Design a protein around this ligand. Structure first.
Ligand SMILES: CC(C)=CCC/C(C)=C/CC(C/C=C(\C)CCC=C(C)C)(P(=O)(O)O)P(=O)(O)O
Ligand SMILES: CC(C)=CCC/C(C)=C/CC(C/C=C(\C)CCC=C(C)C)(P(=O)(O)O)P(=O)(O)O
Ligand SMILES: [Mg+2]
Ligand SMILES: [Mg+2]
Ligand SMILES: [Mg+2]
Ligand SMILES: [Mg+2]
Lengths: 292, 296
């Protein structure tokens, strides 16, 4: 009877969640917070969208949660040891807590959308954009991960890699902009532009990762970067069998040996000219804007 | 010129995605597909959702359920899920995490297809939202206790609230959606008690079937363990309290060491007996529910 009442009380109330609990399970996330330029893009874009700063704040909050959560997970998936010159959360708090916290923040983010409007028609568009771009994000990420973890099952071509980027990187970039375009109280859609900004961003990330070495973690990962994809297809094309295989073998070692990583890079520098190709590819993309 | 052409085309289109791609990413989910729908069908008798809108609800629930099992096995370092090899051991942790999270959002998208009524949608999303949030909190606490042991040893109360969040999330989600779509007293209190019977029973059966008892290997703060731990602390049984902690902290597969911890629960604290009793009472709260305060 006393137990029965304590239970009766329980099952008839909402589940209990204290602020301490909230603090406890937010450790992996608070860690990565300690790591502005994401708001510079939002403030600029806004110069054109004209959103009241009240709503722009809630937009900035949604994107950061989604962004920081993405990084918490991408690090697990990529077995990354450092993020922004700091130990990654999964190495401190563990993979289990990090996955849960990150996925949890995805839903806190989703919850904040209610705060952008009272308008039922608008709200629905918002949730849809939120849904679509998150679905796109996971698709690209699924390919980048599949290609990597199952190499050499599939050697992506420049086209396949770019579709993957349109999904993955474009995902976050389109989410931010598409949401603002729906809240804008006010020319043409800036989506095409943000997609190009996303592609340039990703290929420059892939590129600087190797040039900054020449610590090239992307090689330790086995990632099918823009430079590696060109090297692999170039090599198959010109009949360079041993080079094509050494590239695959090195990617598959998941090595942190600096000399082995340097060898690979010099292969992309003198043998396949992938570094130059990529540099040019980036410049051309930028020129497409600068010459618009 | 020609490169400019292709890029232009690319950025002016939706991201490309074929079904072959869809198949790649689904592999980890398909692997886990290889009684619940009966419970949903049964519940509809009072809800009366049109066999079709009910299929969708059913699909949403299945995506979520199956997806959380894939993530939970990664978090629990489980080598087996119903006799077969767990997905992350076959497809790796990265793809499995991603495929499971992708499915969460596919589930979130099916919600838009239950209704086209603007208020009713906002209420379905809210429900979906709230329950997924409660589910992650319960899981977060469950993992936290397990991974920070012995910083915090939960009490029966703490444990049960963790269950209301975790196990209650997936049970309530299903029920609150159905009740909201119903064309026809809430059964949420009843689903809550159910979830609790189910979880305490899950923890109970895990040890009893052995008497592989993976929960021990996992180091989990299961219901019998929570009892044992607070039972020895109360009776001041120092060694035994520490011995229980020591075994959980071993993350062992040692059949012999697992046996010992169980020996402790059976002989020293009688936690297993205490739990069998607990379950029964909860059920009687339902069995002896005359006037149907909980039952329909
Ligand atoms: C977890 C899921 C589905 C997706 C996660 C996708 C992400 C963020 C991956 C992280 C990497 C690329 C960085 C990006 C895209 C930052 C974008 C910045 C904005 C300001 C939008 P990195 O590790 O940081 O180099 P990647 O090299 O692994 O491609
Ligand atoms: C991934 C996130 C946030 C939450 C996941 C929560 C889950 C599913 C945990 C799995 C376990 C409990 C079993 C359940 C819930 C049976 C399926 C439920 C139905 C309602 C049919 P188990 O491993 O199967 O014993 P647990 O013992 O680890 O608590
Ligand atoms: Mg990465
Ligand atoms: Mg990556
Ligand atoms: Mg589990
Ligand atoms: Mg678990």
């Amino acid at each position: 009877n006393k137990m029965e009442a304590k239970i009766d009380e329980l099952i008839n109330n909402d589940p209990v969640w204290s602020s301490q609990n909230e603090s406890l399970i937010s450790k992996p996330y608070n860690h990565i917070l300690l790591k502005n330029f994401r708001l510079n893009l939002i403030v600029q874009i806004n110069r054109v969208m004209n959103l009241p700063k009240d709503q722009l704040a809630i937009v900035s909050q949604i994107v950061e949660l989604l962004h920081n959560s993405s990084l918490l997970i991408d690090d697990i998936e990529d077995n990354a040891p450092l993020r922004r010159g700091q130990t990654t959360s999964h190495l401190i708090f563990g993979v289990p807590s990090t996955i849960n916290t990150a996925n949890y923040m995805y839903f806190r983010a989703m919850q904040l959308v209610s705060q952008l409007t009272t308008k039922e028609p608008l709200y629905h568009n918002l949730i849809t954009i939120f849904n679509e771009e998150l679905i796109n994000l996971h698709r690209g990420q699924g390919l980048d991960i599949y290609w990597r973890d199952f190499l050499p099952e599939i050697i992506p071509t420049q086209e396949m890699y770019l579709n993957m980027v349109m999904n993955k990187t474009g995902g976050l970039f389109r989410l931010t902009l598409r949401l603002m375009e729906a809240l804008s109280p006010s020319g043409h859609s800036l989506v095409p532009f943000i997609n190009l900004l996303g592609i340039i961003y990703q290929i420059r990330d892939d590129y600087l990762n190797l040039k900054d070495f020449q610590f090239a973690e992307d090689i330790t990962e086995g990632k099918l970067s823009f430079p590696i994809v060109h090297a692999l297809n170039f090599t198959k094309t010109k009949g360079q069998t041993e080079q094509h295989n050494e590239i695959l073998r090195i990617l598959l070692l998941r090595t942190s040996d600096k000399d082995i990583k340097l060898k690979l890079i010099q292969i992309l520098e003198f043998d396949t000219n992938s570094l130059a190709y990529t540099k040019n590819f980036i410049n051309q993309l930028v020129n497409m804007i600068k010459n618009d």
